[PDB]
Symmetry: D3
Subunit: 256 residues, 6 copies
């Protein structure tokens, strides 16, 4: 297994003793994903990508962070939905910070943080900075971190044309939409019930945000766009592009 | 999709259950910690989650995603935080995570939570998280949120059971880290993650009535275990499991009446 | 007098708030390197200038701006390894925003517009808003409304973009010390800009990921992510009116008398 | 002059640490209800009394004891719903331990014995130690050693237990305001104990789980988890000498010349 | 049944608070060097003794005094570079005061007098009070009243000052280990003061600013900011009676039955 | 040519810092009510104005000033119950100071002058400095020197005070929106002062203790602690030149090349 949790400490130690061992940490969330999908999607997807990437380039995967930052209206629907269970920014930042400090203690020096929940980004970044600051204080400056959101590797125009034949509107409305639902159909079809999809128009917002979150500004089902056209085929295409692109980046940044 | 695991439900399935009136939520709290040469490191997550799954199925409760990282491993209970693999959180982080989740469950309208600890060292930080959350709920005007905290192993106290588990004599849960107790449960639940042939049959670990910091590696058995899992078995694991599941289910039934 | 709260007496401020529908605006910037051709307080000056004009036009008041913001990121601001750039930890920025909102609530104010001028500040401003609103709820206050925005997001009209980038627009992705900010500065503070020092280098391109610690080799030496060679006062005057008008209308919509 | 740092001049203290092998001891207690028969500062009085005697024997120094500890838990201290009990949040206690260690390290001290007298303090003292040691490591200090213990853990000899509980031993589990602490108080602070006020009730029994908010109905009315009726000055003297000798020996072992 | 909460059983404490108008007092001190002639716990001993006497006269209760305070400052306490002085970070002191106030409110207490004995503590005690009152408000409690004071502020009567300083008064700015505190200690804890060790150096003078890291050369070698050579037990008795009567009256005025 | 860091390019700043001996100055103020006759950003304006003139005379640079300070206290600034006054929690102000010093140390700067213009900021600035210096030590930096001061502390010459208060000097205790600040404002920002609104009430007098929640009845209605009726541009010019020369000399002495 490529999962750190499924190894003995001796097995883990041997791998880190190699000197060039790469570790990967999935950072997700428990967030509503419409009427047609489960709430652990943001954990499941990055974990699935990490698994395949780790198997492809010989890395190990740390247990994923199940809870992420508060859902935002324009990206996740809003934190007023039941089910969505979010952490305060400081909590997520401190979790990332503690994990990095511990990996450094192990002697590990290569980490790939793979985000699956849009809202986590800056808090992951702060956790990285704070940990690196402490490592410098501990006399460690050879620890390198690569952070990314897996969907950012799906930029190729040819690929996008295949996923959105009718036309591409952007990733702005991709919460529980075609993109995530397609991946789930390819990975965990038993957790997707396409017949429950509410085919509503794409959500649109002005160039500003309002707080407290106004429930009237998010589509009733919680999705920001319809997943009606999602398919296992699109999911497999997305999956291959992401696994391929990320494996390549890791090979470039963390050569053996 | 219908499941006891909240993560596998759509928000409507979850909302429907909470709207039911007296929904009980369970939250496994584990750790990523070394467990000798014979077992994997996510044992403290796997075990309380497996117990939660079975209890939930019997009493109709739901299980929240488990906390994968716990408080720093202590020499006398988990071998110590100097071992590789063990990845621990600072107390404030664990406390804050528990606090945040309770704040959110309350917002959802849930009012019944069972926190099932699988990592000894987590206890007091889970407790502080609960107290800080209940304090905020009170400020929010909520005083009917009830929390039950427990470590599944505490439900295995029946002398008859203890005798079956330790026919050679019981020394106590004191040295039960990667020992007979946890290993047997793993053999009954995740045999593939256990390799009894790698077990180091060393004598029970003993310590003086105090602790030393920085942690002294010499005071912990080399394998990381505090006792030998040499006599562990699937059969013992099955007895432990059923005992914990039946006992915990009854506890919830009494504390969270319909 | 002035729309700046700092330039009012406490009685004049009290009278404005007493009106019952007073709107307050808070610029949030940073002290950050902006190439060889511009000064480092750009992110404070610009949102403050926009706030000043929106506030005068719609009758709102402007709070003292936050001079320091979150750590500069490589892909948006060049990186926090640059000298001069002086950044706050996230908790610090979040706490300042949270504290100011708590105080405005105490004054009896209930309408706030947070105008970001530094890309990286966004989520920390958002957390400060959430933590403060959570407290107001505990205090029994649930009628406080906050609008948060980055002024550049109001410059989207295709026609406007065409006039600013007649050669083609490459997204605000590389707009750190580039045509957009420099043009605004040429229209507002020409004395703090010297186009003769602009380094006309091709726009910065990055892979779809980030590396830490920050690698200096991945940021154009000058600190800019794109060249401000084609910047001008006229372009700045256009950007300024589009922003002021747009934000002013957004406020009239969300905060009606 | 005195083993207590608080009663020393800074010169006397300095000279003692200047010796090079000075051992410091920090009592950590609490202000907590202790039934109808004893005062509320017991948790600090006891560890402080034990430290004093140990210090006088091995030549150590005793720091002012922490008067406020972590929240009282139902199964160990009755619960934090009792009046009088005044508890700190975990972070506060941890921060205090952490600050004291930092300061002692600054003094040049490198040997500390933390003696806990309030069960619930345990994990927060441990976290304070770790955070402090982490900082000391960053400061280039890695020769600072800490011994942490709860004085009652040194009373484990079967024979001694026999003289304390000749009627049978149930365990320290129910020892809150019971025979153990009450006996020590009778031998150390007899004027703070009115054994005639003891409410004789069966030992407290709890299911293998905890409930929050704490349910007052699950704690014996008086606040004690067991009866102190059989407590005596004689048992106190026995417990005391056993603890002092055991702890002095531990210190000699962990902090040799 | 004394005035010290720590020496009361929870039932006795509960009865006093149940009375309806119970006043609680909390001494806030420090462990700080006090020259060659006095022990280091002077800052907790003095306010505690004053509280004890005020409480016995007005019927109030005294909580365990805080033994550790904020970092000693050069111009007020000699500086935090001295051995012995063991200080808390500001967040720690603040949180301790906040936690205690929160707990007193839980008990049902609504009247508190915080008596400071360490100058540097003041602003952190103030923040602790504000943060706690903020939470009480969120909890629905708005009748909790707090009086904060440094016992020495009650000694400003010209006739009194003339008695204590017949050679001329220069102010309390240099009263660290000086005539004022030493005289009080001679009247309350003679065994902890060794006047024969006083260093009769001239009053410390400082420029109108401070330097960090603290410069040891700017503090008089002994640690004292003024000579306590003219300190006396008689002067201490005068200061004591003046403070006690003054504080006792203040409490009557602020907390009328 | 400007001495303000915000008005420099990062290249200009880098050159100055790398040149060595570069003294940075950070003004720390507040947004606080200053009576019926003056604006609320006085505490920012004054120290910033002093820094500018001092910097121009000794070759130092001035960082963007902190616009928000700690909570206004009744005896020094009227109280934090006034509208307009917008204050930070202590931790927030302390964290801001701490983050800035950390960053300046990263730039290679090693000399900093913190100029406070809001009385209540003092101790939180001090804690910010201590925490930052602690981290710098962990980073291997032990040559960073900080000077902290309140500009008014340089106005203590009898001849000067006699010239400013030709009717008896009572002290700076009642100096909040009084003759001192109002005079400085008349010499620097006359348009932000309207002496015709000055309320000529007697100086404020308070008992030797504080009360919380703050009691509005104990603060002069206008918010001023003393009357500024006798304020003048001439008195302001004298104060300004005295402070500028004094601070310039202090810096030359503490920060020689
Ligand atoms: C927009 As998303 C993948 O964080 O739900
Ligand atoms: C002592 As254990 C069950 O947390 O490994
Ligand atoms: C990317 As920006 C407008 O904060 O310099
Ligand atoms: C269980 As106890 C000695 O802390 O009251
Ligand atoms: C200046 As003092 C009375 O705290 O020693
Ligand atoms: C007393 As003041 C100059 O901080 O207003
Ligand atoms: Mn998401
Ligand atoms: Mn464990
Ligand atoms: Mn920026
Ligand atoms: Mn206790
Ligand atoms: Mn002092
Ligand atoms: Mn002020
Ligand atoms: Zn998603
Ligand atoms: Zn385990
Ligand atoms: Zn910018
Ligand atoms: Zn006790
Ligand atoms: Zn003193
Ligand atoms: Zn002022």
């Amino acid at each position: 297994s490529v999962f750190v949790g499924e190894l003995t400490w001796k097995e883990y130690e041997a791998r880190v003793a190699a000197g060039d061992c790469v570790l990967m940490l999935p950072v997700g969330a428990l967030e509503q994903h419409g009427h047609h999908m489960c709430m652990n999607v943001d954990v499941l997807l990055p974990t699935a990508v990490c698994k395949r990437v780790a198997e492809r380039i010989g890395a190990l995967v740390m247990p994923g962070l199940q809870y992420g930052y508060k859902s935002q209206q324009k990206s996740g629907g809003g934190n007023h939905f039941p089910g969505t269970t979010s952490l305060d920014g400081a909590t997520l930042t401190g979790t990332v910070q503690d994990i990095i400090r511990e990996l450094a203690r192990h002697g590990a020096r290569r980490l790939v943080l793979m985000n699956g929940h849009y809202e986590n980004s800056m808090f992951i970044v702060e956790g990285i900075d704070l940990a690196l600051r402490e490592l410098r204080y501990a006399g460690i400056q050879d620890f390198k971190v690569v952070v990314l959101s897996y969907w950012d590797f799906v930029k190729d125009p040819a690929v996008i044309q295949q996923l959105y034949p009718e036309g591409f509107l952007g990733f702005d409305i991709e919460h529980g939409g075609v993109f995530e639902t397609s991946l789930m159909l390819a990975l965990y079809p038993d957790l997707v019930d396409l017949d429950r999809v509410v085919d509503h128009p794409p959500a649109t917002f002005p160039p500003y945000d309002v707080f407290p979150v106004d429930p009237a500004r998010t589509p009733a089902p919680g999705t920001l766009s319809s997943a009606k056209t999602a398919s296992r085929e699109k999911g497999e295409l997305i999956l291959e592009v992401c696994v391929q692109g990320i494996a390549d980046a890791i090979r470039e940044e963390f050569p053996p």
